[PDB]
Amino acid sequence: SRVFIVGGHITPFVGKGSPLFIDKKHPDFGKKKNMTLEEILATTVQGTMEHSGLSGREGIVDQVVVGNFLGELFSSQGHLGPAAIGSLTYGQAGSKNPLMYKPAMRVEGASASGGLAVISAMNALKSGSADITLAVGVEVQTTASARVGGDYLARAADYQRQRQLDDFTFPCLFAKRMKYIAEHNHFTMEDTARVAAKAYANGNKNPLAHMHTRKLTFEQCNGEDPSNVKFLGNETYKEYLRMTDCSQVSDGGAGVVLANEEGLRKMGLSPNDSRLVEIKSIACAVSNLYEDPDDACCMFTSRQAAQKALSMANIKPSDLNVAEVHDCFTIAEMLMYEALGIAEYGHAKDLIRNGDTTLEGRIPVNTGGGLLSFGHPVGATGIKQIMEVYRQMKGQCEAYQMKKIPALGATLNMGGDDKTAVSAVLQNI
Amino acid sequence: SRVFIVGGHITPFVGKGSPLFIDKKHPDFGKKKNMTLEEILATTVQGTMEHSGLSGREGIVDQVVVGNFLGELFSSQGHLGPAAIGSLTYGQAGSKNPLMYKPAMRVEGASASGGLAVISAMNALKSGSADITLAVGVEVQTTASARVGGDYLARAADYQRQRQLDDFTFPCLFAKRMKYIAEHNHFTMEDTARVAAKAYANGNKNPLAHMHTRKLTFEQCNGEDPSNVKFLGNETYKEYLRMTDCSQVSDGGAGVVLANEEGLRKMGLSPNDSRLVEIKSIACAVSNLYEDPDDACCMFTSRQAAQKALSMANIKPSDLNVAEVHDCFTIAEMLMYEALGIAEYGHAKDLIRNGDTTLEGRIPVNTGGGLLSFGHPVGATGIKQIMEVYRQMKGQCEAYQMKKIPALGATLNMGGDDKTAVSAVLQNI
Ligand SMILES: [Cl-]
Ligand SMILES: [Cl-]
């Protein structure tokens, strides 16, 4: 019935611009390779068990759900259920494996895949099938060029209808929102530069962040840097999107262990244990892939998911102390403030202008960098969000730790152009 | 907490060799096109609603789960949750849509993806979060060459480890089993020819079957036909697999509406309604993608799933009156009889030699053709299996209707080389 976060793990998120990423320019180029999807999933499953107190007793996990979007394209690998079952002892041939024969599957809803894993794992916990579940999200996207990656990520779009917009289909869909947003004075490209400045400043305090080592001023984020190019091909939307407005092409993983009251009891924990966080509610809303709303200024689907979650938890947005939102673009972060309801329609700009969502603000958002600086390994992201609220609640975030420990948090995870949304309310214990 | 099949729908399964498939050789070549994935999903969702009594009240469905393996490769399209949400009114611009904002997602575990959609839907029904769910499985595989297709289906294998075996990786993995099976006298290539003779004879009575129009004798299935080629490239395994031993590359869909007692109440039905079949149990077992058991003569994972399901429903294999099993190859059907437990280890051969699993036998299996003749649109298969037991129980199968209406049935759906398995026990009402 009730559901608890017992622990979890986030890998460093890596790609171009991280010193952890091996390219023709890294001391180990030709000597060592970046992790494969299998290696990331192994590290993520192992790390999750290690930081959840399950070492030696991994057999008490009832089910495993993997969130992943594009493994079949980037890594030529689907069927990650049995890859997850083999991840606890990966590379140790013939070893005993307590996860053998357990239920496992992959779920997918574009960049909401990790959020969907969490809900699926929660349904299992409330259904009689499971008392302890492991939800892991992983992605490897660095194995193709930027343009090829665009085409792959267009699988999140209505591909027949939208791939034609630009090779960078998904960035073009958000540039298209921005043109409409600017035409209705909803917010500006100066506002979106401010989101980016905050994300990179936050990421500079987060050693796991893809962009940890990159420092960017507001001025650079606002286009006073010749390398911050307007890179789209589509001439209708090109002027509305800069490089710094975009989430990173990252590899990484995140996992969480979730338990109901009987799972806690099996682990020797009581529901009042101060290492725990309760998932007070979770909700999913999905719209029509084939049709878009006219009002680009409103993410109606994300707004539905958040309102369902907040209502199920019996709280209002003003009760929230921290959030993680889906900043796949700076443009999206701004819309997410309004979808979540921490700003009224047309007032996200007030928040970003007054610093309310910065680390020292009254409602910090994406405290570790978001998709923009922390990075965006698609499948991992939904779970990374849950774990970031958890980490702030437990005082674990070091240089980006909030000074006032948050009592209530929310997540809002999105797939595609606001076509899938998953939202959770977390309560600190 | 109880779960009922209310109704469902299966499309014709189409591909090369069906008269319903449009190729340079069909009267409508150049005039009409085969369905796209979107069109198949539209037809399947609409048909499932229609045949389940939900037309005009589609809004009482709480959520949709889609099973699909390779859409992101064959159709450049992932994110099928929102595609499913737009499927009821697909092609009708701006129409009212009662499915808007409902939860939806895609699940995947290779050729067990449909079976996984059913389990996920059932978890929702038992957890408080749904009373009526739609589980739909769809696949389109006719959009690539055989060899490109082969590489795509290799996403079911451990791609790094196994892709090198043959361009037809997955077939080769079953040819490899057959070599070991022959070496241990477990069963013979005559036995596997007998499975195929049965599938095609059954398919000839099924107008939805991909191979409905193809008649094949035992002798042809046993290699007395020059066109029944041993097509593998790998010289170690080549001699152990004929064309007629393989499932079809098919396009199609299947859907089912599942409800709990409160769902039945909302639809105006009672749990004793003669249009219903109860799912007495369902189980999933997943093994290690990276490691294979020595004994090719046993599908351990599938055996685990079926034993779990039978045990949960409190029955034995001898109680079963009908079964649908995963005949991705003739070789697999034989192993499935032993995994399901209708034959003891080493005795599947007794069953196929005596006709026990034919339409007139005491335990008819794959009454409509199986994956071999009915066809294998990957994602649909797990749900087609459920709907075929349902159809036999309700007397709906016409020329392949069993003379004795079955009281108990079992499904066994498998992903990859026995790495994921889903098994259900159905009870006629
Ligand atoms: Cl996405
Ligand atoms: Cl498969």
mmCIF file of C-alpha atoms and ligand atoms in Angstrom, chain B residues 110-111 156 416, ligand 2:
data_model
loop_
_atom_site.group_PDB
_atom_site.id
_atom_site.type_symbol
_atom_site.label_atom_id
_atom_site.label_comp_id
_atom_site.label_asym_id
_atom_site.label_seq_id
_atom_site.Cartn_x
_atom_site.Cartn_y
_atom_site.Cartn_z
ATOM 1 C CA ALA B 110 11.585 -9.312 -27.307
ATOM 2 C CA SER B 111 8.936 -11.852 -28.410
ATOM 3 C CA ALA B 156 16.640 -10.202 -28.758
ATOM 4 C CA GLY B 416 14.760 -14.491 -27.094
HETATM 5 CL CL CL C 2 12.516 -12.975 -29.526
#
